[PDB]
Symmetry: D2
Subunit: 205 residues, 4 copies
């Protein structure tokens, strides 16, 4: 596309996009065009407004575009063209990316004992309400644990809320502990674009 300002917009929150170069208040010669999950190619929005789009996005008195509560379908491109009192045309181009932060992840199941030298199910971590999905990461004593790296295995499931579209992640960690290591290791789970309480199992030689 064209040169644009990247905007990250949280779902459920308002968004105001500036129409650069527009007169401070009406009358203004300006037009907004957007191409999002709600449109078939470009949709034109004018200061007059009207219709179904008045429930979604409206042009404010200062010419800015206002969305009262961003949704997944508002991802896309938003552009304004305005004329100033003289007659200079000014363009504003925005690439809008939407997101949602999940709740704190939690460990829903965990082993209290691990046996060194054999594979063990360490635990299951769940995260609810992210957009886009993201992924869950595991940590050992505060250091990242790399999946499928000869001893560490991670499997993950992604499910979508049928109405909101937000993602729930469920990740399972298996480890083969090395003999002669820490007997009370600390494991934790985090959401990769917060972190869980650490679980502290016992390891046997």
């Amino acid at each position: 596309g064209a040169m644009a300002q990247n905007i990250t917009a949280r779902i459920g929150e308002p968004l105001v996009l500036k129409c650069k170069g527009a007169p401070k208040k009406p009358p203004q010669r300006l037009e907004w065009k957007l191409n999002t999950g709600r449109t078939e190619a470009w949709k034109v929005l004018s200061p007059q407004g009207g219709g179904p789009w008045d429930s979604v996005a409206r042009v404010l008195p200062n010419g800015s575009l206002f969305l009262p509560a961003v949704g997944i379908q508002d991802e896309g491109i938003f552009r304004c063209q305005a004329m100033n009192r003289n007659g200079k045309e000014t363009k504003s181009n925005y690439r809008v990316r939407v997101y949602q932060i999940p709740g704190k992840p939690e460990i829903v199941d965990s082993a209290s004992e691990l046996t060194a030298g054999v594979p063990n199910k360490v635990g299951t971590c769940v995260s609810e309400g992210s957009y886009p999905a993201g992924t869950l990461s595991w940590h050992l004593d505060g250091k990242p644990l790399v999946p499928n790296e000869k001893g560490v295995s991670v499997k993950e499931q992604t499910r979508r809320h049928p109405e909101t579209g937000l993602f729930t992640l469920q990740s399972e960690l298996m480890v083969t502990p090395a003999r002669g290591g820490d007997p009370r290791p600390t494991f934790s789970c985090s959401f990769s674009p917060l972190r869980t309480a650490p679980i502290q199992p016992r390891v046997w030689e």
Copy 2:
């Protein structure tokens, strides 16, 4: 994919999908899996149910899957696997395609007079509330008018309702009437995937 029964489901209407080979009532060994606009790959649904999915699709006592009101996002694939009393497994595979019929199309503007031998704007037709979009067709004396036929030109605009996702179509017809033709032709507009407009009958000058 696999061999499936094609199902067409109207938006807003209920849908019942049969789980072939399931026992008539509980207990039943059966499982539904669906992959639609609402899922990340396959979602498993069981007779027990529960959770957010109970507002969208639930397994009935006879093992069928029931959606109270189909939406655009229910397009996709729906499968059941069941075991009968004897113990034979039976699979059911459905490809669900969703649609909505628009209201009757309307002519929102039309010429009352056309001049033969020059291009004329005949009229504008609008259709609201289709899914998928479809297209608008023009007719002259009950015969189809083919766009871009050296004399017939058609332009069309498709807009999407920002909350329902249903389409509104707006089509403009221009024609160059041939000298020595019908002086009172009849034009009509139709929705193409009743649904035809009242005909307009302008006057043509030689």
Copy 3:
């Protein structure tokens, strides 16, 4: 989107799109913009050309846009803006939809005998090389046969060529013939957006 001319373009065939209002030959003040399966939002193409896009679409001397062989990814929107010798701006807007016609469908398996009053597998029809997929229809004595209509059952499979993206369809027809009907019915299969040879089984009362 905006008011556009709908263009249907066959895959593998050239496409020429007119830039209305452009001067007949250079120099011309004109610009093409396209948004297709090949682009991230709008891509601008100029008469000078250059780069990777010269293998796909180029502006001709008369200002028209030329694609030597349309592919699936050329579906989308194509627009031109030009200035004439005076200075009138003219816009051209095209919505391009791509397709491919399959080969003649064929019956790959068929019953030679049907028993009235019970379900029978009548036959299997295959169509190769369509885009978009389309569907296969069955006919009895030249009349359409409606699927899942208490006596008629149709199942269909759609597969995609891994490299070309063209679709292969396979449809199976089952019928429960009505007692006291035609003893030598004629069935045929057709591609719905040609037709097969009719199969003519024998029916028993």
Copy 4:
């Protein structure tokens, strides 16, 4: 979907996916199913193979699935079901995500002088050949520069190669230098999903 091993596969490189629990060599009771950019829902692949798919993915003697050179359209889900000698079934489920690393980013234009207290165009950075697109980040004296921070503005353009589908990024940085700061700041550009540019060191006037 279901519980799966996440696999990251570089475009143009081979990929081997293990069919867990399959016998080491034929005969094997196993089946692969994949749903990717190349398929309409699930495609079944067998050890026998054959057809157009033999140019893309084939089952090896040990039952693993092999793709000689991954492409963008191989993103998706790959599953195996096998039976061992005893007779136990084992399933393998993979979620395959494809990527490509761009070339080293470059500064294609830069200011040699900046004026404190006014907005200045610092430079333009370009990255070619990423998948998915990614983004370009700017740094000042090794610290991240946050866009739209009342004084820092960044605009970016993403273009797609019309035949390979790989992305080219172009990012422009503008800053309003604060009076009384470093007179020879160092700016650099980096690719964000080595891959950092040489730093530019303009002069700033008070």
